[PDB]
Structures are given as structure tokens and as C-alpha cells.
Symmetry: D3
Subunit: 295 residues, 6 copies
């Protein structure tokens, strides 16, 4: 019920933007998604700095001036959670946007506001596995929108995918890029396992560089699971020994069906999903530097 | 401070606001319109009001947004909005349809849109005497990725990249090529060239938004005996053009007097079409008076 | 059993078989056709027989398949197959041209095709009252990679991908975009929209098979005074259409009442085209009697 | 005559036929394989049988074809077909999976495939000393349109287009670029170049079929210490290569000595890979004895 | 043996450019091809002004400054032919290029030279019909080079096509554009006949706007042959009742074979080829305004 | 006035000229090189001379030009050329291979190239302290249209469009994206970014020319313990880069201190690599002395 907004905690109901904002009207903003986990002993924010660092990278990429440092945004999160006394699982949404009414597309020199909402949050995707479908919509291409930024207007594309998959009776979309390579869910990175090797599409194929994908790559290297950042085709998805989605909201979600073709809820996925939970729960000493305690 | 219509009710512009958690703000899921009203001394006339509100609702059906108002209801809303502020001068009117619920999930199914209508004084968006335009590096977003024929909010991040690129680098406005490298639009305007006495404008299928100012030019070209072809334009046809201009609601009819440093005359067809458009919007052409909604 | 024509002989349908090592089976090097015959109560009329057989032959020359029969021969062979079976009811007739020799090598030069022609009882392919369609993830196979204008066997793996994708979700049919992102085909049907009183169909160049039902529809539109444009269609124009329908030999004229959840009316143009097509194929339009081949 | 396996029965090759109305014939909905057996003087060894049968099954699941046999079953069925025929010489074995039911409809869901397996005497597919290749006008069919990694029947119309184009001019084989312009395939072969001591082959994602000869070559390179990169190949890198060769079950290891008139040496890497492959398939490499299935 | 060069007639051997010219080194020039026909009574230059007008349009498109008007270039042609006393069929090559040595790619402000050579010339293509082949090379695309200009560096693409077709045992190439639509020969526009309707690809498909194509469109309209400027696919080429190439050098050349598929030497082509010859020969009064007499 | 080598003979630069009818001038059919020599006080050293001349000949084989000289002969020619002018200062050397015959026909088969070599004093092509770069509207020409890995003359019309666009609009240099919109080159330079301590440069397959200055940077990065990845770069990775630089023979190692108005530090890796390159070319690193051809 308290939300941070430009350096102040305000009630939920005052964290609002004019309807003439070019952020609303032109998809001109950036956002982030950050989890905090309650383990019974504390509340820990997962990879806080890395997210706020990417928030600012996203802004720089789309030419939005965010007048806060990653440290002051990081501090604001913790202060936003303390203000509300939350001792439970949360999703945290920072969003950067223009506060002023403006009809002109010329946004040079404008200065973003940032708001930080923390809300109680369970599971995005079914933990025992989802049914996925390749959609008709392709991922917006680097030549038209800067897709490595988590920029707000891009997610129209993501919405068309998420809705198509869902109206068609599946749990989540898979999007192919302009060249036809599997790249992303609607908000998720994607991993396959092919003969004991983990594959995820490289930065250049049009993906957003996920922090949960990054954690997955570290987990792999700890576990000695050979991993490649390599383009994935539909056919390799269809023929996968295992497949899974990753993201802040999704966590580690097995994909047990692609376009009607059943996939094993496999062992590589289970080992990653298990170790990711131990990590966020603060049960792996080595990865404690990524947990920010709130109390 | 102005009154703004918001879901049926007139509120101060300071109250026409939406939660920062709205999937509209966060994920560019909304639609919008641009509509002018013109003061002619006698009355305030809103231009092609019904056509714009029908487009709002087509935009919305294209992106799967549920707007719970009719075109007639929206059109009345604009009239009530301008009146309650007693404006008697030129206005730009912005209808914006968006989700006023906080929602983190991308699954926007089932949600019903809000609609705000702001009417503001305004203004010429472009230099009447003409603009210098650049072909930008950024490609116009493609139909296979976003439904670009909707005036949908998220798509404009593409326009912004364009508009900033042109301006930052010296120019007044961008020209964007499609994925197949044909000329398609400005950043918020449709484009016309005149080649050998023939008007050319990119067709619907190339990636444009179907402009109402575009449509009006096509009617004007017919009144005036100027041949018109909805036909793909290449960057070479731009460079060689005898005349070029932008059109749109804010833009009106704006001559392009330079493309990538190559100079264009402010030409006779452009001026004829600009001149007629002004007659039309000011209520001086009988035939077009059903396009004008009087406010008072 | 029922008799089937195979290389100039009427054989029982159990003998109408081809070695499993044919390069037509193993590499999709064949052509086919789809032809209907309709019983009007007096006689059984085969609809545009010669046009279908001419097109089989164009399909072959396109792919380099050597069909040792003329259009006229194949046309007569149909008429005898129907007669042999004593059919007095609506049929779908399938001419299939393919290699009867076993051959592992991809070098199919100089081989000579066989032709088999089967006539089968057949009602409707899609719901008469209208079908729900989904734009699929599969794009239409591109001209740069196979000769899509030919009705060629190996191409239809793409059509099956699309057809199954749509039906696996309980939609009735697929719509497929071409590589450039424009609507082109159902899995086995040409597509028409109505948009502001104008009938639009993707043009030849977009990657369609040149349907003969399509061609009929184009003649009927002229007869009826309906303005018609062969122009690229986007997904946005489909979503926003006033009406939409599929056409094909098996499909006839089927209204599209849903596309990606967006409802479309079963419209007046589609109805009037459906009703006129029906009267043509039953012999009730005297100008079209030349398209109707009597069997008895 | 020679015996062929058809659905768990050894039949004479004249009975190994399929109705001409199968959707496998009419719509290219099938999968196949190519497997060799080699006579070394002591025994006939089938080369990587189980890997080929595993891949048949992956090909089917990719296309949604229901093959009611396991890899192991099909593997044994091969061994019996060879034995039935008393062959004691080099063979090409063709497993073909396809629908034995007649069906006009594109909805192939839930149908159950038949499998036929033929074993035929077979020498060389391409000149041992090297072949002249042409980059063809036809591009490899794209993943967005068919599932190229599957060895699926309907895809090979594209391969025939390419194969015929090259051979019509008296070249021995085709090279095909993918949609993005990168070298991917011969008509029926994977491609390798040597460029400055490094063996390069297009990668999985580029649109290739994952050849088992390709996979062997990759194991042999590791054995031999030859640095290997799976990276996209341009036409320029082919023209400029130190060496080039095609690989495939039928092709074995064939040097490419001419591409678009540009001469290439019959090189040392290609020779050493060819010689090692030969020794592997004859049972003279003890580490690879697990890839060799004895028939007798 | 006399050639015009920057306002002077010089012998063939002095019409030369430094090897360090950025025109030679970077394909930065424009050119034209113009015929003159000897009819026994005079020598007439076909559509001289229209060609010199396009020369200048080409330069303007690639940003080459040509300091002559179309009229002065037109005059120079006639003066170049008179100087040589030619009374026979000629091809005329105007080429505009940079005279200065320069390694920098920055050609702004440079000022072209123009040279005008007139040479005796027979037939480019076999008058009774050619065998054509679709090539592996695609026409350079409008997004990379301004292909509506007859600019010199572009013709590398054309060369790769012409050579491929020719090394493969055919008479001429057919090039498909980036989208796969038939657009051009290596130096020729292309026409098909489909059920009595003439089709040629539109300006936008990547073609150069040929003057011989334009004459063909006028001839069609005189003859009441219905004509469409419409995209052509390979399949429509394969299934054509007739096909032909047009260009200054090619004239009207039937295409009697495409990729092994025989085409009729048809009647629409013959009527156009016949009327084009009557035209250039000065036997059609109506089209006399396009012939410039030399004597 | 300088002596220039021309087909084996030394002539005054005024005589190193070619007919205006040459298919090289008219149709961009030729190849070229850029090579430096560096005065170090002790001698004049030509840098990577043999490597550049081998590239000339690869360029030529790629475009089908017949250059009738060996790499060794060309390399000697450069040495003889610099000597005959007695230069003892920094030079740019331009070899250019072209057709000295007048030929109107595009069929260039059978013709033999001439080669001229000019050696000229020069010069820094770019601001040592750094350049401002723009992403241009023009796409880098594609492999499916021209053999862009050849340093072929006609391709540069693309570079010129780029270079003029950047410069005309304020900037020092262009950056061009490929057809697939990945970052590929400057107008005559290869590009490097530094992201999180890692050097990145677009790989061979994306459309670059394989620069010798590029190769030298890859060797330098190895000497210096700086990790390097030949890997596609997106415009977002450019914008976010910690450092960026151009490399090429004329360019040397040029920092990029602005990309599309976004400011970059003149960074530490760039400076380290620039510094080493200068040591290398001036004969101060023993290991690289086989790269230096002494003139005297
Ligand atoms: C946010 C996002 C992801 C997931 O990233 P995390 O940092 O792991 O939450 C994946 N793909 C896209 C398109 C996204 O926007
Ligand atoms: C709104 C808009 C136009 C202009 O439409 P009008 O109806 O004339 O105001 C043109 N192009 C784009 C991209 C637009 O959003
Ligand atoms: C056969 C076919 C049609 C319809 O053609 P008709 O002759 O009208 O039956 C349409 N599309 C495709 C892809 C086809 O194969
Ligand atoms: C079968 C095939 C190959 C070669 O695969 P192998 O298993 O090595 O015989 C290569 N390319 C394509 C297109 C194929 O169909
Ligand atoms: C010159 C040219 C033509 C033919 O034009 P004409 O003006 O008829 O000589 C056709 N195509 C291209 C690519 C050309 O350069
Ligand atoms: C010549 C060239 C370079 C630089 O090559 P160097 O061998 O380093 O001089 C880079 N890019 C392009 C396009 C070039 O022509």
C-alpha cells in the first residue's frame, strides 16, 4: 500500500501518472521485475543491484534520463518493503516513465520519474510444467526496437504472444525471431537440453539478457553441465530431451508440451530448479552475495 | 487547468491519471487518437470526429482491447469536453484508451478499457513553409511483430527512435523505411510524393497507419484533377521527386523542402492541396461540411 | 471397391497403388488436382473440368514432371471414371500425377509420369454457416524455395503443418502469412475479405495457388458489380474486415466468422457470392453452362 | 524380385505399394532414411543402424507422424530384410514411413504410419575423384515453413529443384544457400570446407539436416586432431576455400573440385577424412566397431 | 576514334582516367547506353534527350555533380557522331566519373567529368530468341544501393549474373529480387505475356526504369494490348505464353527457353519487335519526335 | 609527380590511366588493396605486404577477375615502386586490378586484369583522439547480391552512400548494419566493441571484409590477455559498450567517442591496443618483424 515515487513513499492511490504522458501514449519507458523471498528467518531480495543496473542500461539504450543511481534505487526498494512491513514473497516492479503531459514525440531532455511497487506474489507459471505453443507473432526485431532494453512499448509484441497462446488453450507462448529461430517466451528466457547439453539462444538472436538465465548459466558451471549459447530451431525444441523457461516471475518452469509434442519433466531441469530455490532461500553460502536482507 | 473526460465524467486534468502499475504504462497496451478542432470565427469545428472515433475502436479490436463505448458516445464526449472548458480557439484532442487496473501479468484478456479525452490548445507541429527530412536508420516496425495499422501506444517507441534520430542529427523530421526498405511514414505522419504530375503515397499493405489526413488528401486530389496512386515509394523516387510533403492531424499538410540534403521546391501541388485543406477545415467547402462537428 | 483410372485403364481401387520406392512418395515430386461434380437432380456436372486439367499440366511443367496426356484426354478419362462407377451424386475427383518407377536418385529428369484419377462421394469440407480461423505460426512456403503456384505434392507438408496447428486447438481452419508477413492462403483455400464495400484477395505474386474457385469468384464479382482488388492483405485488415471468406473446390464459399477470437458477421457479399456460386454449379446460370461438363 | 519389409512382413517388391490416394503421396507427409551396408569380404556391416532408426522416429515426431515401431524393431527388420535377400555386397537401405490409408483431408491427426524397408545393391552416388558444383537459384526451404531437420518426404521437392538445376547444366551437384544467404546443403549432402587449416561446416541452426555422416566426420576430426568449427559459411569462403567436400550416406566423402568454375584442389584433409571413413565402415577401426551391425 | 570528354573531342587513346579515381576504385559513377540507327537516308539517335535526362537523374540520385545540362550532352552526342562521320548503327556510351585521383571515400563537392563514346554496334542478344536461366545471385536491393540509378558500381551484381548464366551454357540471366520476384535480366527489362496480357515488374520491385520498356508500354497502348505493371514470379515465367527482354542493346529479344522450359517465339513479341524496328528506322511518323537526325 | 607501377613497368603517374570504356570503370569490376608503409627513422617498412597481396588475389578469384601476377611478384612490385620514388616517409600504397580493354558487354569472361600500384604519402584518415559515429540508414550490401568478402570496386558505392550520409549529417564516420540488422562495419573500417572487459568484433559470416588490421588486433588481444569473441553485435550492445573503436589500414586504431549522440570514453583497452599496434608497425616488437618488409 506504500509505493516509492521520486524519492517519497506515497500511498498506492497517489502513484499515478497523467494520461497524457508520452510514456502511456507512446510506450516510452523502462521497467524491471525483482523478487524478494521470505525464508522464515529474513526476507531477501534476489540480485537487486544487477536489476537496478539493467534498469539504467535499458534507459540509456532508449535515451530515457533516469536521475537515480543503482544504489539509490536499490536502497529505495528495501525502504519500500520495510515501510510496508512485508515478511512474505514479493514481486517488485520498478518502472521509469515521463511524469509530464506531452503529445510531441520529441522526448529529448525530459527526465524520468521512477516508481517502485512491491506486491505479494505467488507463482507465474505452473511449477510442475507448462504446455507451450509457438505463436504466429514474431519477436520485434533489433532493426525496429532496441529489444535488449526492458522498454515498455516493446511488450505489446509480448502481449500479442501471451494472449494468443492463452486464448488457444496453452499456458505460454514461444516466439520465433524475424529469421525464424526460437528466442523467448512472452516474458521468459528459454533453455533446452539436447543429449546432456544445455542450449539457450545468444544475446544477438533478439533476447533480453535475463538475470535468471544468467543465474542458470552459473548453476550449470557449478554443476559441470556443459552449456552453449546457441541458436535454437523449432525442430530442436520438438526433438528436445528437456526444455524449460526461466525468468524472475517464472523462476525455473519445465516445458512439458510444445505444440502438442510431450516433453519429459527431465532431471537437468529438476536439478537446476532445486538449486535455484536453495539459492534464493539463502541455503547456498557461495551465492549469498546476491541476496539483500531487508531486516 | 482544464476539464478532461474520463470514463463518462468530467474531472480536472490533475485527476486524469492512471496507476503506475497499469499494463498500459508498463507494456504499451493501449490505443489513441489525434483530432483537431478549428476556430473559424463563427464556431468551433471538430474535424472528422466520427471517423477518428471509429478508428479508435478499430485500433482497439485489432489489439484486443475492450473499449466499452460507442463511436457516437465518444464523439459526444469530445463535444461535452470542449464545451465544459468553453474553448473558442484551435485545439488538439487526445483520446486515449488504456487499462486503469494494476496488473503485472501480460494476460490482458477480459479487462475493460478506460477512455480519457483531453482537449488542448495547439499549435502548428511543423514549419508551414516546409521541413528538412532525413531517412533514418530505424526501420518501421513490421506487421509480423506488431499490428501497425492500429494506433497502438507501444508501437510509438519505434516512432520515438526515429524522431529523436532525425532531430538529434539536425533535421526536423524522420522518414522511415519498412522491413522491405520501401518508404512508409514519418514518425507521426503519412508521406506523399509528386512525381511527373502524379501524387504517390505508400499503400495500406506497406506498413502505414491509414491516416485520416491521408484520406482527405485523396479526396482533395480527386476534386483537383491530380492523379493519385497508392503505390510503394523507393528512396530513389524520394530523391528524384518533384515535390514531397507530410500529412497528419497535427502536421496538417507540411511541405518537405529537403530529403537527406537534397533540396526540394515547395511545390505547386503541395500548395494547392494545403490551401484546399485549410478551406475544408474552416468550413468553406460546402461538400465537406458533414466532416465538421460544430461545438456550439 | 469402385473403379479408378490408372494410366488409361479402369482398375479396382485396391490395384491403384504405387511402389513405395517411387521418388514421388519419398521426395514429394508429384502434382494433383481437386475437381467437383455436382448432381442437380437431372444430371451430374463436372465443374470446370478442362480448366483443372489444363492447370495439372501447368503444375507439371512448372516442376519438370512429364505428363504424357493432354488436358482433353484427362478430361475424358474423368468422365469415364464417373460413368464406370454409376455415380449420381456430389463427388470430389482427385487426379494425381506421380512417378510409378522406383528411384532413390533425386535426378528425376526424363522419367515419365503416371496419372491416376479417383472419383469419390463427398459432402462439405467446412461448416456452411462459417468457420473460426487462426493465423498460424507456420508461414507459407516461399517461391524462392518451391514453386508454390504449382499444385505440387511435396509443398502440402507446409499446408498440413498449418492445418493441424489450427485444428489441434479446435479451430476449423488455418490462415497462413507469407514470408513478407501478408495473409495469403488457408491450408487448402484462397481467402477474400470485404473492406468498406470492396472485395479484396491476395494477388498472384504473394505466394497463392491460383484457385479456380478464386477465378470464378472474380467473374461472379464482375457480374454482380462488386468492386474487386487483388492487393496484399495484412493481418490488421483481416481483424478489421467487414467480412471474410475462404474459397476452394472442396471449401466452395465458406464464411469466416472468427479470426484469432475477433468475431466477424456472416456478411451479405459472402452470402450473395455463395448463393451465385451454388446456382452456377447446379446449371441454373445459363452464361456459365460452358463450365459444366455433363457426365450422362 | 527381392523381398521388402512392409509392416512386419517380408513381401515381394511388387506388393510393396501404397494407394495413390494416400495423403503421403498427395501431400508429402512421410519420413525416410538412408542407410548403407558394406561388404568387407568377411561380413556385411550396416553402418550406424540404430542411429538412423532413432533419427527416423525423431523425424516423425517432428512432423506429427505416428510410427508404431521402436528403433530396435526397425533395426532388426533391416537385418532380416538383408538376410532374406542373401545379399553379400554393398547396399543402400531405404526405410520409408508413410500413410497406407487413402485420405483427401489435410487433417492427418491420429493416423498410424506404415513402414517399408528396402535393401538394394548400390555402388557410388558421386564421382570418387571429385565433383563440380554450382550454387543454385533455389534456396533451401526455411524452418519457418517446413521442419527441415526432419528427413521428411515433402521437403525434397526443393532438393529435386536444386539437383536438377545443377545437373541440367552438366555439373554433378548443387549447393544451396539458406534464406539468409549462407551455404547450407547439397541437394542430398552436408558440406564441409577447409579454410586455413580449419575444417568448417554449417551449423545446426542454419537449415541443415543433421547428417550422421556429418556427425561421423566430426568424430573423425577429433580423433585426427583437426580443428573444427560449426559456423555459417558464405559463398565467398567457399570460392576461396583451400578444400571442400560433401558428406552423406550415399555420397560418403566426396571432394568438391569445382564451384561456379572456381577450381579447388582435391586436398589432404578431405583425403585423410575419406580414407579414415573407409576404414571405419569396413571394420578396420576397432574403436568404431560399435557402429557396425553384422548381418550374418 | 574521336570521343567527347569534358567539352572537347579527343582521340580514343586520350579518353582515359587515372587509376586512382574513386570512380574506378569505388564504383562511383553513372552511365547510359543510347542507340543510333542508320536507315539508308539518315542516322537517327533514339530517345536522346530522355537518356541524357536519366543520366542526370542517376547522378542526382547517387550525389554525383555533373556540370552539363541534358541539352549540352545531347548536342555533344550529335557532335561526336558527326566528328567521326559515322553513317551506320552505333551504341553510344556516356559515362560520368571523377577525373581526380582520390583514396578517401568522401566524394562531397567533387565535379564529374563526362565522356561520350560512339561505337559501331550490331546485336547484343540473338534476334530469333535466347535461352535464359534464373541465377543464384539476387539483384542488389534498394536498401543497400540506389538501383533506380544507372550507377556503375551496381553492375558488379549484374556481372555476377551475366557470367553465371553464360558459364552455365545459356544466353542470359534472370535475376530475382531480395523478395524472390523476377525483376531484370543482367542488363534488360523483362516482359511476359499471360493469357493475352502483357506483364512487366513495377518500378518498386527493384528495376531500372528502362527507356525501351517505356517505348514498349507506348507500343502496347497503340496496339490495344492490355498491359500491367505487376510483380512476376518464376512460376509465372515458367508458365508464360510468351516472354521477352527489352533494352537499348537488347532491343526486343524473345525468350524461348527459361531454365530448360521451352517458350513459344510468340505473336505479341513479334508484333512489338516489328513495330519497335519500324520506329527506330523512322517509318512511323507519330514517333518521329524521338529520333534525332545526325546530318 | 610519382612513378607508378603498371603491368610490370614504371611510368609517371600521369600515364597510369585507363580507357573510359573499361568494364571496370563502367560496371565496378575490379579489386583493390590498401597497404601502408611506415618510416621509423632507420628504414621504410611495408606492413603485412604479402598478406595484402594474397588478399588481392583472393578478391580477384572471388569476383572471377584474372590477375596474372603472383603475390610475390606484386610484393616486389611495391618495393620497386617505393624505391623508384625514393620515399622515406609514411605512405599509403594502392594496388588496383582492373580491365584495361574497352568493353561494353557485361560478359567479362576470358579477360586478363591489369594491375597498377601507386605509392603515396599519407596521412591519418581519422582523428587519433577519436571519432563520432552514426548508425546509417543504408544497409551493408549482402552476400546474396555481391561477394562482399572481396575488396571489390563496385561494392564501395554502398560505402560511399554510408560515408556521405554520416558526414553530411555532422559525423566523422558511419556504422552500417547488415540485412539482418547486426552491426557489421564502418564505411572502410572493421569495428570492435569492449563489453565488460571482452573485446567483440562481428564475425566473418555477418558481411564484413576480413581486415588485416582486424587480424592484427586479434593477435594483439592475445598478447595482452584481453578476451576476444568474434560474435554478432547489435545496436543495443553498441549503445551500452564500455569502449568502441574502428580498425583498418588507413584508419589504424581509431577510438569511437560517440555513437548516435551517446558518449563513449576513450578507453583503456583501445589505448593499449593502439599503443601496441604502433610499436608493431614501427619495428619495436621482435615477434612481428616478419610482418615488416624493409624497402632499403
Ligand atoms: C524480463 C524479461 C526476461 C526475464 O529476465 P529476468 O531478468 O530473468 O527476469 C526474459 N525475456 C524478456 C523479453 C523479458 O522482458
Ligand atoms: C496518427 C498517425 C498518422 C496520421 O493520421 P491522421 O489520422 O492523419 O492524424 C500517420 N502515421 C502514423 C504512424 C500515425 O500514428
Ligand atoms: C487447390 C488449392 C486452392 C484452391 O484452388 P481451387 O482450384 O479453387 O480448388 C487454394 N490454395 C491452395 C494452397 C491449394 O492447394
Ligand atoms: C539425408 C540428408 C543428408 C545426409 O545425411 P546422412 O545421414 O549423413 O546420410 C544431408 N542433407 C540432407 C538435406 C539430407 O536429406
Ligand atoms: C540500362 C538498363 C536496362 C535497360 O534500359 P534502356 O533504357 O531500355 O536501355 C534494364 N535494366 C538495367 C539494370 C539497366 O541498367
Ligand atoms: C579494406 C576494408 C577494411 C580494412 O581492411 P584492412 O585490411 O584492415 O585495411 C574494413 N572494411 C571494409 C569494408 C574494407 O574495404
Amino acid at each position: 500500500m506504500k509505493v516509492w515515487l521520486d524519492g517519497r513513499l506515497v500511498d498506492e492511490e497517489e502513484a499515478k501518472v497523467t494520461v497524457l504522458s508520452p510514456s502511456l501514449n507512446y510506450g516510452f519507458g523502462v521497467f524491471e521485475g525483482i523478487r524478494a523471498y521470505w525464508n522464515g528467518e529474513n526476507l531477501y531480495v534476489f540480485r537487486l543491484r544487477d536489476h537496478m543496473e539493467r534498469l539504467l542500461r535499458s534507459a540509456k539504450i532508449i535515451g530515457l534520463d533516469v536521475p537515480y543511481t543503482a544504489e539509490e534505487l536499490s536502497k529505495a526498494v528495501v525502504e519500500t518493503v520495510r515501510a510496508n512491513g512485508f515478511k512474505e514473497d514479493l514481486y517488485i516492479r520498478p518502472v521509469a516513465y515521463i511524469s509530464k503531459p506531452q503529445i510531441s514525440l520529441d522526448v529529448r531532455g525530459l527526465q524520468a520519474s521512477v516508481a517502485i511497487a512491491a506486491i505479494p506474489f505467488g507463482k507465474y507459471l505452473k511449477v510442475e510444467g507448462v504446455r507451450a505453443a509457438v505463436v504466429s507473432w514474431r519477436r520485434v526485431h533489433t532493426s525496429m526496437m532496441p529489444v535488449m532494453a526492458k522498454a515498455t512499448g516493446i511488450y505489446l509484441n509480448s502481449i500479442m504472444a501471451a494472449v494468443e497462446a492463452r486464448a488457444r488453450g496453452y499456458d505460454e507462448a514461444i516466439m520465433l525471431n524475424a529469421e525464424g529461430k526460437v528466442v523467448e517466451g512472452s516474458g521468459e528466457n528459454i533453455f533446452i537440453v539436447r543429449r546432456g547439453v544445455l542450449m539457450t539462444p545468444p544475446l544477438e538472436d533478439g533476447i533480453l539478457e535475463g538475470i535468471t538465465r544468467e543465474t542458470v548459466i552459473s548453476i550449470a558451471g557449478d554443476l559441470g553441465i556443459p552449456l552453449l549459447e546457441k541458436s535454437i530451431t523449432r525442430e530442436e525444441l520438438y526433438a528436445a530431451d528437456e526444455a524449460f523457461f526461466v525468468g524472475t516471475a517464472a523462476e525455473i518452469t519445465p516445458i512439458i508440451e510444445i505444440d502438442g509434442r510431450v516433453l519429459q519433466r527431465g532431471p537437468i531441469t529438476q536439478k537446476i530448479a532445486e538449486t535455484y530455490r536453495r539459492i534464493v532461500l539463502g541455503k547456498e553460502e557461495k551465492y549469498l552475495p546476491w541476496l539483500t536482507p531487508v531486516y
